[PDB]
Curated annotation (Swiss-Prot), chain A:
<feature type="binding site">
    <location>
        <position position="153"/>
    </location>
    <ligand>
        <name>Zn(2+)</name>
    </ligand>
</feature>
<feature type="binding site">
    <location>
        <position position="156"/>
    </location>
    <ligand>
        <name>Zn(2+)</name>
    </ligand>
</feature>
<feature type="binding site">
    <location>
        <position position="181"/>
    </location>
    <ligand>
        <name>Zn(2+)</name>
    </ligand>
</feature>
<protein>
    <recommendedName>
        <fullName>Type II secretion system ATPase E</fullName>
    </recommendedName>
</protein>
<feature type="binding site">
    <location>
        <position position="184"/>
    </location>
    <ligand>
        <name>Zn(2+)</name>
    </ligand>
</feature>
<comment type="function">
    <text>ATPase component of the type II secretion system required for the energy-dependent secretion of extracellular factors such as proteases and toxins from the periplasm. Acts as a molecular motor to provide the energy that is required for assembly of the pseudopilus and the extrusion of substrates generated in the cytoplasm.</text>
</comment>
<comment type="subunit">
    <text>Forms homooligomers; most probably hexamers. Interacts with EpsL/GspL.</text>
</comment>
<comment type="similarity">
    <text>Belongs to the GSP E family.</text>
</comment>
From Swiss-Prot, chain B:
<feature type="binding site">
    <location>
        <position position="38"/>
    </location>
    <ligand>
        <name>Zn(2+)</name>
    </ligand>
</feature>
<comment type="function">
    <text>ATPase component of the type II secretion system required for the energy-dependent secretion of extracellular factors such as proteases and toxins from the periplasm. Acts as a molecular motor to provide the energy that is required for assembly of the pseudopilus and the extrusion of substrates generated in the cytoplasm.</text>
</comment>
<protein>
    <recommendedName>
        <fullName>Type II secretion system ATPase E</fullName>
    </recommendedName>
</protein>
<feature type="binding site">
    <location>
        <position position="35"/>
    </location>
    <ligand>
        <name>Zn(2+)</name>
    </ligand>
</feature>
<comment type="similarity">
    <text>Belongs to the GSP E family.</text>
</comment>
<feature type="binding site">
    <location>
        <position position="7"/>
    </location>
    <ligand>
        <name>Zn(2+)</name>
    </ligand>
</feature>
<comment type="subunit">
    <text>Forms homooligomers; most probably hexamers. Interacts with EpsL/GspL.</text>
</comment>
<feature type="binding site">
    <location>
        <position position="10"/>
    </location>
    <ligand>
        <name>Zn(2+)</name>
    </ligand>
</feature>
Length: 407, 261, 146
C-alpha cells in the first residue's frame, strides 16, 4: 500500500483523494505524503482550514474568513505561485473542485479529501457536485478509503478460536479479544492504527468513469483488482493487532423463445443462446354460437426477432417443412434473471409456418417476423403478490389441437 | 480558447474508445506523457481554438425579435462550427490532446446485380447500387394439425435513381436474367466493419421497377424487386467486442428444384 | 414520538431541525432536547438570538451585533471549542447553513430551526438557500414539524 501510494503521489500531475468519515486520520495520511515528497526539487503549497501543524520546508496558507480568503480563492492564489504539488484541505463545493480539476490537467499534482464512506464514494461525490463525468477519468489517479482501528494491548489480549460465522469472514485459526487491565486501563486497547483501500485508476477504470457504468459495475471491477477496506482490517486481525469487533464497527418485460435446439444470440444469463423476442401475438376463436356446438380455431403464434444466427435454421425448417419437438416462449417481469418468469407458453410438434424478414437504411439492427404452427400448446402463468413473491403455484392451460381435447 | 500543444518528441498514440469516438477505420488520438524536453509534462507551447459567429441576414432577425440563446444557438450550429469541433480537428491532426480540448470547453447496405454498375462511393463496394431499404420473406404451407411446400417471395429493395436505372428497366423489359446478385449488409463504422449478412442470389430476373419523385426531394428513389432460382443467406455472428464469433451460419435453397443448396 | 426523537438527538452526528410558524414552541422543544442530553459525558454549546433562558451545565453564547458576533461567526467559533453537540438558534442564511452542514459531516451533532410550514418544507428550505441537494441527504437525520 505504501509503495503504491508512493508512486501515485510522485506522479507529475493528477488528483489523489483520501476519503472516509470524521476522525479517520486523513490529514495525518496527507501530512505523511507531503513530508515524503518534501524535497528541494519541488515546490509544495497547501490551503487548509485550519492548519493541523507546521511542515518545515512546505508553504501552508490558512483559510481566513476575515478577508474572505476561501478554499477556492486560496487554491486560485496558490496556482499563481508556480507550484509542482498542491494540497487542498478538502473540496467541499463545485467551485473548489473545478479549480482542482483544472489544476490537475494543467501540470500540477493535486491532493485533497472528501467525506465519503467508500473509495467509489469519492468518484461518486465528484459526479454529484457537477464535475463532468469525463473530467474525473482524465485527472483522477486514485482514491484512498481510510479508517482507524484501536490496537489491542499486547500485555492483555485473550486468544480464542473463531466460530463458523467468524471463520466465514476470512487448522487452528486463533483471533484475539479485548479484555481489560491496568495498562489496558481498563479497556481492551491502547493506541491506534490505520486500515486502507487504495483505489488505483487504470485504463479499465478510466472507461467506467467516462461511460458511467455505475457504483455497482465499478465496484465489481474494483474487487477484482484492489483489496477491500475489510480485507486489510482482517489481515491485521490475523496478525494480532486489532480485534474483529473493531474492524466490523468502522466497516419493460424480458421475452425469450427456444425453438428445439436452435441457438440464437441472447446475452441473458439464464436464457443464454436463445432467440430474443421483441413482440408477439397469439389468439383463438370459438365458433360455437350459443344462440341456437362448434369448434375452437387456434391461430399460429407470431413473434418478432432480430436477424440472428437462427435465421437460416428457421428458413430451412420452413422450407423443408420439418417440425421441432418443442418450442417454449418465456416471458418475464422487468428487473433481471432473478425475476419471476410469469408467463411460459410451451408448444409441441412445432413447424415454422412463415418467415418475414427485411430492413431499412436507417435501422441499426434489422428485425423479422416468424409464425409457428403446432399440434399442442401449454401456457403456464405464475401469480404474484403485491410485494412480488409468487402467490401459490402456476395454473395450467393445455389443449391438444390435433386431437381437439384437453392436455 | 487556448489549448496546450502536445510535444512532438514525446506523445503516445492510442486508439479511442466508444465514448471518445462518439465525440468525433483505426482512429488514433495522442496522449500527454512526460519527458526531458517534455520537461516533464505532456506539453510545450500553445495554440488557439476558435468559433467565429458571423452575423448574417438570419441572425439579424433573431437579435431584433429576441428569439433567445437556445433558438439562436440552434441556427448558429446549422452554419458555424463550434468551439469544440475546431478543437477536435486539432486532436485528429495531432496538435493537442482530447483532455485539453474538454477542460477549456446505421447499417451500410449495398447490392451488386451481375455486372451492372451503380454509383456507390464506398471504398470496398465501389460502383455498386446503394440500398436504402429491403424486404424479403417465405412461407410454408405445411401444417402440424394433420406435407406442404415453401413459397419464396421476390427480394424487394429501395435505391436512388442512378446509372443502373436504365439497365434494370431493360432487364425487366427484355426478361433477361443475370448470373448472380449479392445483397451485402454491414455494421455501422466503415469498410473495415463486419459484413454480418450477405444474401447471394443466382439466375436473377428484375421482376419489377417502381420509380418516381416529388417536388421536395433532393435525391429521387425507386423500388426494385428481384426474382431468382436459388438463394444463399450467410449470417456472420459477432462477439461483444466486435470480433467474428466463429464462421458464418449458412442457409441455401434451390427454389427451382425445391431442394437444399 | 419521544423515543424516536430521543434516539435521533442521541446520534453521534447529523442535523436535526424543528420547523413551523412563529409561536409554535420550537425553542421549548430544543431546550427540552438539550436538557435530556445534558450529561457529564458530552460538551454542549449553543448560539442564540437571544438566549431564551439559562440551562445550567450547558454553554450558551448570545448573538451580539455590537462586536459583529453573528450566527455564522458564533457557530464558527463554537466548532473550535471541541463540541460534541451544537445548537444554533436558527439557520437564516446560506453561510450559517454551510457551516452547520460541515459541522454535521465533521463528527458533530447539529440542532437548529427553520420557519417552514411542513416537515418537507425544511428539506425544501435548505435546497432553496443553496445547499447542494446531496449534502442534505448525507447530514440530515430528521425534521420535526411542530
Amino acid at each position: 500500500n505504501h509503495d503504491n501510494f508512493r508512486r501515485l503521489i510522485k506522479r507529475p500531475h493528477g488528483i489523489i483523494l483520501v476519503t472516509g468519515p470524521t476522525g479517520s486520520g486523513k490529514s495525518t495520511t496527507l501530512y505523511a505524503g507531503l513530508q515524503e515528497l518534501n524535497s528541494s526539487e519541488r515546490n509544495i503549497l497547501t490551503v487548509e482550514d485550519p492548519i493541523e501543524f507546521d511542515i518545515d520546508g512546505i508553504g501552508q496558507t490558512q483559510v481566513n474568513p476575515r478577508v474572505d480568503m476561501t478554499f477556492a480563492r486560496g487554491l486560485r492564489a496558490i496556482l499563481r505561485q508556480d507550484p509542482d504539488v498542491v494540497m487542498v484541505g478538502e473540496i467541499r463545493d463545485l467551485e473548489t473542485a473545478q479549480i482542482a480539476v483544472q489544476a490537475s490537467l494543467t501540470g500540477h499534482l493535486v491532493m485533497s479529501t472528501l467525506h465519503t464512506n467508500t473509495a467509489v464514494g469519492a468518484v461518486t461525490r465528484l459526479r454529484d457536485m457537477g464535475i463532468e463525468p469525463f473530467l474525473i477519468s482524465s485527472s483522477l489517479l486514485g482514491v484512498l478509503a481510510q479508517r482507524l482501528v484501536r490496537t489491542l494491548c499486547p500485555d492483555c489480549k485473550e486468544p480464542y478460536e473463531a466460530d463458523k460465522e467468524q471463520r466465514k469472514l476470512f487448522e487452528p485459526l486463533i483471533l484475539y479479544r479485548a479484555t481489560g487491565c491496568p495498562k489496558c486501563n481498563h479497556k481492551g486497547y491502547r493506541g491506534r492504527t490505520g486500515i486502507h483501500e487504495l483505489l488505483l485508476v487504470d485504463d479499465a477504470l478510466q472507461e467506467l468513469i467516462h461511460s458511467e457504468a455505475g457504483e455497482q459495475a465499478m465496484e465489481k471491477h474494483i474487487r477484482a483488482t484492489t483489496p477491500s477496506i475489510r480485507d486489510d482490517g482482517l489481515d491485521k486481525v490475523r496478525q494480532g493487532i486489532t480485534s474483529l469487533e473493531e474492524v466490523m464497527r468502522v466497516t419493460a418485460v424480458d421475452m425469450f423463445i427456444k425453438i428445439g435446439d436452435v441457438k440464437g444470440e441472447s446475452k441473458d444469463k439464464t436464457h443464454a443462446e436463445e432467440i430474443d423476442v421483441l413482440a408477439w401475438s397469439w389468439g383463438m376463436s370459438q365458433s360455437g354460437s350459443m344462440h341456437m356446438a362448434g369448434k375452437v380455431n387456434v391461430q399460429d403464434l407470431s413473434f418478432t426477432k432480430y436477424i440472428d444466427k437462427s435465421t437460416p435454421n428457421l428458413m430451412m425448417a420452413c422450407s423443408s417443412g420439418k417440425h421441432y419437438p418443442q418450442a417454449k416462449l418465456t416471458i418475464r417481469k422487468a428487473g433481471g434473471e432473478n425475476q419471476v418468469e410469469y408467463l411460459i407458453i410451451t408448444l409441441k410438434e412445432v413447424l415454422v409456418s412463415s418467415v418475414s424478414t427485411g430492413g431499412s437504411g436507417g435501422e441499426d439492427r434489422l428485425t423479422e417476423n416468424v409464425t409457428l404452427n403446432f399440434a399442442q400448446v401449454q401456457v403456464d402463468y405464475q401469480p404474484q403478490k403485491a410485494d412480488g413473491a409468487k402467490d401459490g403455484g402456476p395454473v395450467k392451460y393445455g389443449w391438444n389441437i390435433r386431437q381437439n381435447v384437453q392436455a
